[PDB]
């Protein structure tokens, strides 16, 4: 689930706090996708 791994990424761990930080930088380059 490369498209649904986002919600599962935090499902296990508890880094959701930084998720909003890493998720914005990892998705800030969608133009190259």
Structural class: mainly alpha
- State the helical fraction: 40-55%
Radius of gyration, CA atoms, in whole angstroms? 10 Å
Strand content: under 5%
Distance between the termini: 17 Å
PDB class: antimicrobial protein
Keywords: Pardaxin, Pa4, LPS, trNOE, antimicrobial peptide, STD NMR, Ion transport, Porin, Secreted, Toxin, Transmembrane, Transport, antimicrobial protein
Assembly: monomeric
Entry title: Helical Hairpin Structure of Pardaxin in Lipopolysaccharide Micelles: Studied by NMR Spectroscopy
How would you describe what is shown here?
- It is a single chain.
- By secondary structure, this protein is mainly α.
- It has helices spanning 5-11, 16-26.
- Its main location: secreted.
- Keywords: Ion transport, Membrane, Secreted, Target cell membrane, Target membrane, Toxin, Transmembrane, Transport.
- Belongs to the pardaxin family.
Comma- or semicolon-separated keywords:
33 residues, mainly alpha, antimicrobial protein, Pa4
Please render the helix and strand layout as text.
Layout (H helix, E strand, L loop, with lengths): L4 H7 L4 H11 L7
In summary, what is this structure?
This protein has helices at about 5-10, 15-25. It has about 35 residues and is mostly helical. The longest helix is centred in the middle third of the chain and has 11 residues, at about 15-25.
């Amino acid at each position: 689930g490369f498209f649904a791994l986002i919600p599962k990424i935090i499902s296990s761990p508890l880094f959701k706090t930084l998720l909003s930080a890493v998720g914005s930088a990892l998705s800030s380059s969608g133009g190259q996708e």
